[PDB]
Every structure is written in C-alpha cells, then in structure tokens.
C-alpha cells in the first residue's frame, strides 16, 4: 500500500505547424513515488495536451470555376454559317479562383474548343414534343407548391454530317449544333412555342429546420 | 470567441473527427482551411473551407404511404467566412420537395353479409362448441380494405348427453 | 529536417526476442508521430506499427499485434519496438519513420521522414 505521485513535467513541445492550429504537448512520469505492492495509480493523466497559434494562414489551392459560355461558331474573317452545311468552331473559358497563400494553381486546360454548326435565328420546321417529367413542387416550404410539366416545339435538326473529318493530322470532329432556332410548328392551345399546365403537390410536409430539428 | 477545433471534417456527415482542443478563436482554427469548428457538444460542425453547399439529402419517406404524396430533401451551406451561392449565410438550409407515389389506392372497407347458419355442436356428448361463420362480400372489400369486427362467432351449445 | 537511426537488429533464433530502439533529432523529438516498417526480402515496404506524439496512442498491423509493442520516451527522444516470439516470416529491414501530426493522440500512416534501416533475421 504505497501511494504513487507525479514527477516533474517535462519540456514543452514546440508549435509543429507553420500555417493555423496545432497541438504541443508535456509529459511527465510517475517516477518519484511510484505505487508499491497496490495503491493507487498516481491520479489524474500523465499527458497534457494544449493549442498553439501561428496566427499565419495557410496554403488553398485554387478552384476551377465554372465554364463560360461558348463563343459564336462563326469564321474569323468570313461572315457567317447560319442555316449552312458548314462545320464550324467555337470556344470556352474558365477562371481560377480561390488560390492564396503560395497554393497549387489549377490543373488543366482553361480553354475548351468543340466543333459546331449553327442554328442561330434560323427558321426550322418543328413538331410538338411529348409531355415533360413532372417538375420540383414549387415553391417548397412556402404556401400551396405546385408541380409544372410542358410540351415545347421542338426543332427538327437537319441531317447533317455529325462527323467532319479533316486533313491535316486526320482529325475527325464530332461536331455538335449551337444556337437558339425559330421552331414552326402548328399552334396547339393558343401558344407557338410552349405550352405547359400545373398541378398542386398533395399532403405537403412542414419544413423543419434541421440544426432546430436536433435540438 | 472560443470555440472547439477540429482537424477533419467528414463532409459525408458532417460531423467533427479529431479534436485538436479547444480555447481558440475562430480565426486562428480556419487559417488552415482543412480544418473544423463546432461550439461545445452540441453540434453543427462547419468546416474552414469557403462556404459551398453540401450534398443533397436522401429523400424523405413519403408523407403517405398511398397515392400522390410528396417528399423532401435538404442541403446545407456549409463552410466558413463567406457565402454560398444565392446570398446565402452557412447554416441556412434549401429544400426540394417531388411529389412520390408509393402506392395507389388506400383502402376502403367492406361490409358484412347475412350470417351463414349455425354450425352442429362439436362433440356428441356433454358440452362443446357452436361456430357461425358469414363472408365478407356485401359489399366485397377493395384494395386493402377490410370488414370490422370478426367473421365467425363461437357459443357453447350443450347436447344434454352422457358418454 | 529530421533525422532516424535504428538500432538493435540482429540474428535471432525462431521464437526469440528483439529490441530495436530509434534515435530522433532532439530539438524537434514531440513534433512528429513515429512508427516502424519492415520490408522482406521480394516485398513491398509494409506498417509494422504506429505511435502519437503522446506515447499514449498506438496502432498495429494484424500480422504482429499481441507480439509486438510499440513505446516511446520522451525523456529521451527514443521509441523502441518489442518483438516477441519472433518468426521467419519476420525477417526484413525495420525502417524507422516520422510524420508530422497536428494532435498528440494522432497516430499516422503516411509519413514523409525514414531512417536507413536495422536488419533483423530470423532462423528456424
């Protein structure tokens, strides 16, 4: 029956990180007294633990937003291919965003290039599509949501090549159709382009809060 | 304000993994961006990260269990210093609510029939056991419905002989 | 940054014990979370096993858990590692290795600093 103790504490460690949070330390023993033949077992822990601060920000690697929009497929100094059996060429951007404190930059090509042909404005005959899968129920939590499915005029695509290949290095091309066409079509209830109809959602549940809904 | 750092965010959960301690501000925690902070036990762990919107929620179950009903599922912007997209603090939530279909009909009951006669007494001799049994089919139950009550009653009949 | 020299390898009868022993860099001992390593002859490098920063907290690999034991002093920049009922099948250069860890409970898996290596042969 010998009552065990704490020795002295030992050196603290240094700050392990140059960037933000991290954890330093001391340890001591139960070395001086020592519990003989039963006792205790010293009492309390033989590890403190404790945060220190750099108070130097760290390294974040850049992100790759989101693409732009694609250029017009048009010809650099030519005019125009709209409504044309002429394959054509346009091109995309993105932009690194994020990237502080000496990160990584982005990985990859920032620009993208794809082979087109070009509806835009041009006037093409059109059939009515089918009916739409029923959308989202709208406005969810706010009064009386509603579901909403359409029948658009959907252009008839002329049967072109959709694969153009090219000399030069024998590049073949899956090219692509760009632009906003004029669909015709017969009207079908009053309306040209798009005619839709809505529905309410039947027995809607009640928005809860999840950080409200723990608690 | 102090508040508990955390080296990893689990993002799959969104729980707190691997206390580094606590009585340490906010701003020291998030310079390393990788980290996490979380006031006491209590929950709502946010990482140190740029705040960016989490994965969608499963889907709620159906608020009924028959014909049209509708469900949920939520997001949560989660991060720190900054919005999300759509002016959105971290800790404001989005929902989207489908409408579900997890059956068709829900049951409406039938009604009973005329009851069937009496059943001949179980045993010959001293006392046994008189069933009545009737359908129900008056009308006949659609889907899942069911008629209330029970479909055979059960006496005592005695046969005032010995054996 | 930080230097590993290992000691205490040896040939050891089948069954018999051995104590190998790592000398860290002294002024940045408490920073980094410590383990052993082993690589056979015709194999991979494989985890042997793993230690914190505290000493407190330790991992093992399934081959070697009940007969090894990782420890460390932190009085004097050693940890060591108890091998006990030794096998051929544990005959390989034991690396020790160091890797920064942000918590002193943290044992690791990955690390960034390795010794030269001590042999250890067994035979049967």
């Known amino acids: 029956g010998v009552a065990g103790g704490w020795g002295p504490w030992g050196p603290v460690s240094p700050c392990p990180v140059t960037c933000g949070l991290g954890q330093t330390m001391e340890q001591r023993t139960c070395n001086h007294p020592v519990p003989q033949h039963g006792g205790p077992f010293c009492a309390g822990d033989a590890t403190r633990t404790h945060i220190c601060n750099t108070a130097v920000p760290c390294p974040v690697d850049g992100e790759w937003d989101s693409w732009g929009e694609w250029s017009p497929c048009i010809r650099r100094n030519m005019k125009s291919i709209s409504c044309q059996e002429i394959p054509g060429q346009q091109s995309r951007g993105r932009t690194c965003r994020g990237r502080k404190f000496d990160g990584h930059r982005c990985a990859g090509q920032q620009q993208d290039i794809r082979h087109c042909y070009s509806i835009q404005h041009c006037p093409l005959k059109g059939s009515w599509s089918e009916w739409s899968t029923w959308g989202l129920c709208m406005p969810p939590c706010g009064p009386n949501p509603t579901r909403a499915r359409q029948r658009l005029c959907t252009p008839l695509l002329p049967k072109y090549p959709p694969t153009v290949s090219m000399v030069e290095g024998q590049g073949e091309k899956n090219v692509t159709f760009w632009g906003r066409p004029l669909p015709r079509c017969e009207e079908l209830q009053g309306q040209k382009l798009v005619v839709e109809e809505k529905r309410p959602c039947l027995h809607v549940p009640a928005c809860k809060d999840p950080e409200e809904e723990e608690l | 304000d102090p508040v508990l750092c955390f080296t990893q965010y689990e993002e799959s959960s969104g729980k707190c993994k691997g206390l580094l301690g606590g009585g340490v501000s906010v701003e020291d925690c998030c310079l390393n961006t990788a980290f996490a902070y979380q006031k006491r036990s209590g929950g709502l762990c946010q990482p140190c990260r740029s705040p960016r919107w989490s994965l969608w929620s499963t889907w709620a179950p159906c608020s009924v269990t028959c014909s049209e009903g509708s469900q949920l599922r939520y997001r949560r912007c989660v991060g720190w210093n900054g919005q999300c997209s759509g002016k959105v603090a971290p800790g404001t939530l989005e929902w989207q609510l489908q409408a579900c279909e997890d059956q068709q009909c829900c049951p409406e009951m039938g009604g009973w029939s005329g009851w069937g006669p009496w059943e001949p007494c179980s045993v010959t001799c001293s006392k046994g056991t008189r069933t009545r049994r009737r359908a129900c089919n008056h009308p006949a139950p659609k889907c899942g419905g069911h008629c209330p009550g029970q479909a055979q009653e059960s006496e005592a009949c005695d046969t005032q002989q010995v054996c | 940054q930080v230097q590993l020299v290992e000691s205490g390898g040896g040939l050891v009868q089948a069954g018999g014990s051995l104590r190998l022993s790592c000398a860290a860099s002294?002024?940045?001992?408490?920073?980094?979370?410590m383990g052993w390593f082993r690589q056979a002859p015709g194999k991979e490098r494989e985890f042997v096993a793993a230690?914190?920063?505290?000493?407190?907290?330790?991992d093992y690999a399934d081959s070697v858990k009940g007969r090894f034991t990782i420890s460390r002093d932190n009085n004097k920049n050693t940890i060591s590692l108890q091998m006990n009922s030794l096998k051929p099948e544990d005959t390989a250069v034991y690396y020790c290795?160091?890797?920064?860890?942000?918590?002193?409970?943290?044992?690791?898996?990955?690390?960034?600093?390795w010794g030269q290596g001590t042999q250890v042969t067994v035979s049967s």
């Open positions: 002294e002024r940045t001992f408490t920073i980094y979370a």
């Open positions: 290795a160091a890797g920064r860890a942000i918590l002193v409970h943290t044992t690791k898996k990955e690390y960034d600093h």
């Open positions: 230690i914190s920063r505290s000493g407190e907290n330790t």
